[PDB]
Design an enzyme around this catalytic site. Structure first.
Site, PDB file in Angstrom:
ATOM      1  N   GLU A 162       0.858  -1.237   0.000  1.00  0.00           N
ATOM      2  CA  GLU A 162       0.000   0.000   0.000  1.00  0.00           C
ATOM      3  C   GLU A 162       0.861   1.242   0.000  1.00  0.00           C
ATOM      4  O   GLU A 162       0.549   2.236   0.650  1.00  0.00           O
ATOM      5  CB  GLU A 162      -1.035  -0.053   1.154  1.00  0.00           C
ATOM      6  CG  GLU A 162      -1.908  -1.328   0.982  1.00  0.00           C
ATOM      7  CD  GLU A 162      -3.223  -1.296   1.750  1.00  0.00           C
ATOM      8  OE1 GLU A 162      -3.270  -0.617   2.778  1.00  0.00           O
ATOM      9  OE2 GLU A 162      -4.221  -1.928   1.263  1.00  0.00           O
ATOM     10  N   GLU A 281      -5.878  -7.510  -2.715  1.00  0.00           N
ATOM     11  CA  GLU A 281      -6.590  -7.454  -1.434  1.00  0.00           C
ATOM     12  C   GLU A 281      -7.994  -6.917  -1.739  1.00  0.00           C
ATOM     13  O   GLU A 281      -8.125  -5.955  -2.486  1.00  0.00           O
ATOM     14  CB  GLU A 281      -5.962  -6.481  -0.443  1.00  0.00           C
ATOM     15  CG  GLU A 281      -4.579  -6.860   0.111  1.00  0.00           C
ATOM     16  CD  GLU A 281      -4.144  -5.866   1.220  1.00  0.00           C
ATOM     17  OE1 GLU A 281      -5.020  -5.175   1.745  1.00  0.00           O
ATOM     18  OE2 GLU A 281      -2.942  -5.780   1.579  1.00  0.00           O
TER      19      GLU A 281
END
Ligand SMILES: OC[C@H]1O[C@H](O[C@H]2[C@H](O)[C@@H](O)[C@@H](O)O[C@@H]2CO)[C@H](O)[C@@H](O)[C@@H]1O
Ligand SMILES: OC[C@H]1O[C@H](O[C@H]2[C@H](O)[C@@H](O)[C@@H](O)O[C@@H]2CO)[C@H](O)[C@@H](O)[C@@H]1O
Ligand SMILES: OC[C@H]1O[C@H](O[C@H]2[C@H](O)[C@@H](O)[C@@H](O)O[C@@H]2CO)[C@H](O)[C@@H](O)[C@@H]1O
Length: 357
Positions: A162, A281
């Protein structure tokens, strides 16, 4: 090779019993790929899990004269050797954008910087990241004898979970850092795939706007991520995106369609660049006032029908122990996204889709 995959972040510090439970559940479920953390940065974070990977700059594993601690490399060794036996492939991510397990802010603290994003710019930080990654990739697994560099059970390295760079909304800081680090890894390891591990944010692309005008920041470059430019880097093999409409400002009645459009947009873009793309994800909170299984069915159908290469839910857990064990004896659902190998409609859906992909 198209697949259903999942995520599990505690494969580098929990017991054999708990590691075996995840990987046996992934096998039993038909989950072919597990995305896991390969980092544990900072003395306080290593002490908290009594497991050491990178407590201080240039110290890899357990510090000299710390006894009775786990070495996170030996835990990752065990997980790799068990996945190899069970036929699971692994994506291993090398640093966290966020402060869990230390992350980029821990590197910034070691080198006396003053902002998270100094991680991408300070040559002393970049040097330490390279040293860590070089240690990890050359590490010889104590259960297999095969160094990670050579281990086919590992499907890919990911640079950073991320990653974001809010201080440079032109996107250039991350493009440069990702080119540097992905090339560096290719230099250490000519056998494995490399991906970024980011959330897939866009930076104001003509014709791409969010569904329902919500979570506009995910489309207009606020995070400093220009996904298209990142995917075009020659030393990046496939694109990664994540999907959490509930975290990003989307209204519940729009979760399913906002996610559908996000998925469509990312596959379209990756198809035009000509590289594989993994939704690596996604999650909807268990309390959302919507049918979560039906949202998951919709998103998986879309990745399947549009020719996306994989869809990986966050996250899979197994049996728990000690102070991480819930009312059924599982590792607890701390974030509202946990799925376990049980009779829930979500677990049933995953088993069903793992047969299709
Ligand atoms: O001495 C044999 C073997 O015992 C233990 O292995 C466990 C393993 O960890 C479990 O996943 C499962 O495969 O059963 C084994 C016990 O039969 C040790 O972990 C291992 O070092 C050792 O070789
Ligand atoms: O701030 C630590 C916090 O950050 C991470 O959560 C992210 C999340 O993954 C994204 O979807 C994003 O929009 O919001 C969060 C950061 O504001 C970690 O995943 C989480 O465990 C942690 O508490
Ligand atoms: O790492 C992401 C994960 O971190 C936090 O969970 C903690 C949990 O709160 C503790 O009780 C402890 O045992 O370990 C976990 C991981 O360090 C967040 O609470 C959780 O939501 C998140 O997924």
């Amino acid at each position: 090779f198209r697949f259903i995959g999942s995520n599990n972040y505690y494969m580098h510090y929990k017991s054999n019993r708990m590691i075996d439970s995840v990987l046996e559940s992934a096998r039993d479920m038909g989950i072919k790929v597990l995305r896991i953390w390969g980092f544990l940065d900072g003395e306080s974070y290593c002490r908290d899990k009594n497991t050491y990977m990178h407590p201080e700059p240039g110290v890899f594993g357990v510090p000299e004269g710390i006894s009775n601690a786990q070495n996170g490399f030996e835990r990752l060794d065990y997980t790799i050797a068990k996945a190899k036996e069970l036929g699971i492939k692994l994506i291993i991510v090398l640093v966290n954008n966020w402060d869990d397990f230390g992350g980029m802010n821990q590197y910034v603290r070691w080198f006396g910087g003053t902002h998270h994003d100094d991680f991408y710019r300070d040559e002393r930080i970049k040097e330490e990241y390279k040293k860590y990654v070089s240690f990890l990739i050359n590490h010889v697994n104590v259960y297999t004898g095969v160094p990670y560099r050579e281990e086919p059970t590992i499907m890919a390295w990911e640079l950073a979970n991320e990653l974001r760079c809010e201080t440079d909304k032109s996107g250039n800081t991350l493009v440069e850092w990702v080119k540097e680090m992905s090339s560096y890894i290719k230099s250490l390891d000519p056998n494995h795939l490399v991906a970024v591990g980011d959330e897939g944010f866009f930076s104001n692309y003509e014709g791409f706007k969010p569904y329902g005008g919500e979570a506009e920041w995910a489309y207009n470059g606020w995070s400093g991520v220009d996904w298209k430019k990142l995917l075009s880097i020659e030393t990046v093999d496939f694109g990664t995106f994540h999907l959490y409409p509930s975290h990003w400002g989307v209204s519940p009645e729009n979760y399913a369609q906002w996610g559908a459009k996000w998925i469509e947009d990312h596959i379209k873009i990756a198809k035009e660049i000509g590289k594989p793309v993994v939704l690596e994800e996604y999650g909807i909170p268990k309390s959302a006032p919507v049918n979560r299984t039906a949202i998951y069915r919709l998103w998986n159908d879309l990745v399947y029908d549009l020719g996306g290469d994989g869809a990986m839910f966050w996250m899979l857990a197994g049996i728990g122990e000690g102070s991480d064990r819930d009312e059924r004896g599982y590792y607890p659902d701390y974030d509202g996204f946990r799925i376990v190998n049980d009779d829930s409609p979500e677990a049933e859906l995953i088993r069903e889709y793992a047969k299709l992909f």
